[PDB]
Each structure stands twice: as structure tokens, then as C-alpha cells.
């Protein structure tokens, strides 16, 4: 059922849960998850976008979760 990897689950969880009106911008995302390299986050973003979990809002790099934990 969890056809996602624990890191991507985590990233998604941060994006969905983080109590900011401005979703979780890529820069905020990386500042939180310092270990999660920019490329790896870009890959995660692509994946989670393709899964229809996250989407970009006010800017390309400004993500929110549609309704995915």
C-alpha cells in the first residue's frame, strides 16, 4: 500500500503538515530537511507530483499537498 519510500513519505508529511499558509517552499523544505540534497528533493518533488500527492501553487517551487499524508 505504501508504494512510497520513507524519505518521500517524510517529505510529503512535512509539506502537508507544516503549519505555514505558504505551503512548504523548496527552500523551507531543504532548510528543514538539511540532509535531503537539492537533487534528491527535486526527484522527490517530481515523484510526489507524478503521484498527484503534492502540487505547486503560488510559484513552481512552492508546494502544498492536495490531500496526501
Amino acid at each position: 500500500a505504501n508504494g512510497l519510500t520513507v524519505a518521500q513519505n517524510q517529505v510529503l508529511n512535512l509539506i502537508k503538515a507544516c503549519p505555514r499558509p505558504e505551503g512548504l517552499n523548496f527552500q523551507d523544505l531543504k532548510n528543514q530537511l538539511k540532509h535531503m540534497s537539492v537533487s534528491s528533493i527535486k526527484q522527490a518533488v517530481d515523484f510526489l507530483s507524478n503521484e498527484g500527492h503534492i502540487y505547486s501553487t503560488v510559484d513552481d517551487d512552492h508546494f502544498k499537498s492536495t490531500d496526501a499524508e
Binding site: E51, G52, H53, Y55, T57, D59, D60, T66, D67, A68
Partner: peptide
């Protein structure tokens, strides 16, 4: 670039 982004996400999610 940005348009029906949420709807696209819902569609992607649903179409699985």
C-alpha cells in the same frame, strides 16, 4: 505554467 494544479494532482492521484 500554474493553472488547475490541484485538479491535475487529484486527477493523477485518482487515475491509479
Amino acid at each position: 505554467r500554474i493553472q488547475r494544479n490541484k485538479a491535475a494532482a487529484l486527477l493523477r492521484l485518482a487515475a491509479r
